[PDB]
Scaffold this active site. Structure first.
Site, PDB file in Angstrom:
ATOM      1  N   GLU A   1     141.214 -24.135 -23.885  1.00 16.25           N
ATOM      2  CA  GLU A   1     140.783 -22.736 -23.366  1.00 16.25           C
ATOM      3  C   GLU A   1     142.350 -22.350 -22.974  1.00 16.25           C
ATOM      4  O   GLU A   1     142.041 -20.627 -23.306  1.00 16.25           O
ATOM      5  CB  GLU A   1     139.690 -22.775 -22.191  1.00 16.25           C
ATOM      6  CG  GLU A   1     138.279 -23.460 -23.223  1.00 16.25           C
ATOM      7  CD  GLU A   1     137.636 -23.416 -23.808  1.00 16.25           C
ATOM      8  OE1 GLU A   1     137.864 -21.953 -24.602  1.00 16.25           O
ATOM      9  OE2 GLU A   1     136.229 -23.415 -24.699  1.00 16.25           O
TER      10      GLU A   1
ATOM     11  N   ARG B   1     144.313 -21.063 -25.865  1.00 19.55           N
ATOM     12  CA  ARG B   1     143.060 -20.238 -26.364  1.00 19.55           C
ATOM     13  C   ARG B   1     144.039 -18.666 -25.702  1.00 19.55           C
ATOM     14  O   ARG B   1     144.132 -17.850 -26.661  1.00 19.55           O
ATOM     15  CB  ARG B   1     142.155 -20.563 -26.959  1.00 19.55           C
ATOM     16  CG  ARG B   1     141.415 -21.522 -27.870  1.00 19.55           C
ATOM     17  CD  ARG B   1     140.522 -21.791 -26.989  1.00 19.55           C
ATOM     18  NE  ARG B   1     139.427 -22.671 -28.735  1.00 19.55           N
ATOM     19  CZ  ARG B   1     139.050 -23.848 -28.442  1.00 19.55           C
ATOM     20  NH1 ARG B   1     137.841 -23.100 -26.710  1.00 19.55           N
ATOM     21  NH2 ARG B   1     138.386 -24.316 -29.136  1.00 19.55           N
TER      22      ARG B   1
ATOM     23  N   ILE C   1     138.339 -30.854 -29.235  1.00 19.07           N
ATOM     24  CA  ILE C   1     138.388 -32.180 -29.507  1.00 19.07           C
ATOM     25  C   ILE C   1     137.612 -33.116 -29.722  1.00 19.07           C
ATOM     26  O   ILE C   1     136.824 -32.091 -29.412  1.00 19.07           O
ATOM     27  CB  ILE C   1     138.761 -32.677 -27.699  1.00 19.07           C
ATOM     28  CG1 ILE C   1     140.313 -31.483 -26.840  1.00 19.07           C
ATOM     29  CG2 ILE C   1     139.281 -33.854 -27.261  1.00 19.07           C
ATOM     30  CD1 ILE C   1     139.504 -32.031 -25.132  1.00 19.07           C
TER      31      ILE C   1
END
Ligand code: NAG
Length: 246
Positions: free
Chosen positions: A160, A163, A71
């Site tokens: 996250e 991911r 970000i």
């Protein structure tokens, strides 16, 4: 662009958002069936915009670098905010240029600096869909200390989760009740670059990691990942940081 609305959100609608987020990230290659993020993208195409809406329908737009899922900054009404780091200043040349004013946050976007600004490690910061709703609301009006905690929540519940399937599931479990991240969640976050590298190095090493990755598992037990047959590689990780960026 991708969007997520907290009003009426449930594990299913959140899962759809994380799916959209993953699918918005370009790749020309998969490594062991996992999408390999690009070495680089030039110009505005480098940044994905995430439109996030709090429960009341108020919105921020978050700029995400599609090569690393970092970000860079966000837009809240007519003010843009960017991390105090060269990659974010570069992003500010391309996104949210229509903002009436730009504020550079008084920290970079890495966990260590954010935690210092927030006054706590993210081990102690509850995450979940309610925390995300709070985070969006906080970011609507500038408060750099509050924003640091909000950004820790924001990063973990978006990037996250994109991911790692495990992290996405952890947030789904926290759809109506926040809870601090599991030690496993923290371990995976900290190991994404390492895992991404070793999975790529395995390509010409018969599926074997050149250097083992130490992780904490669901039970709180520390374990070693040595090759691509591991559950972390076959099921969990969903995006690979390109070695050219490591
Ligand atoms: C590879 O990792 C698997 C899964 O953890 C493990 O059971 C096995 O001992 C390792 N195999 C090799 C060849 O390194």
């Amino acid at each position: 662009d991708v969007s997520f609305r907290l009003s009426g959100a449930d594990p299913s609608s959140y899962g759809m958002f994380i799916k959209d987020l993953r699918n918005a990230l370009p790749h020309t290659e998969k490594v062991y069936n996992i999408p390999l993020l690009l070495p680089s993208v030039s110009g505005a195409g480098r940044y994905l915009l995430m439109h996030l809406f709090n429960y009341d329908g108020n919105t921020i737009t978050v700029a995400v670098d599609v090569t690393n899922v970092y970000i860079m900054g966000y837009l809240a009404l007519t003010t843009s905010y960017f991390f105090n780091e060269p990659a974010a200043d570069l992003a500010s040349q391309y996104v949210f240029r229509s903002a009436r004013r730009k504020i550079t946050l008084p920290y970079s976007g890495n966990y260590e600096r954010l935690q210092i600004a927030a006054g706590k490690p993210r081990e102690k910061i509850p995450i979940g869909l309610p925390a995300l709703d709070t985070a969006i609301s906080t970011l609507l009006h500038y408060d750099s200390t509050a924003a640091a905690g909000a950004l820790l929540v924001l990063i973990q519940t978006t990037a996250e989760a994109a991911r790692f399937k495990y992290i996405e599931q952890q947030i789904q479990e926290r759809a109506y009740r926040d809870e601090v991240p599991s030690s496993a969640t923290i371990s995976l976050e900290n190991s994404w670059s390492g895992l991404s590298k070793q999975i790529q190095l395995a390509q010409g090493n018969n599926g074997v990691f050149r250097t083992p990755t130490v992780l904490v598992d669901s039970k709180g037990n520390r374990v070693q990942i040595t090759n691509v047959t591991s559950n972390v590689v076959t099921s969990n990780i969903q995006l690979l940081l390109n070695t050219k960026n490591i």
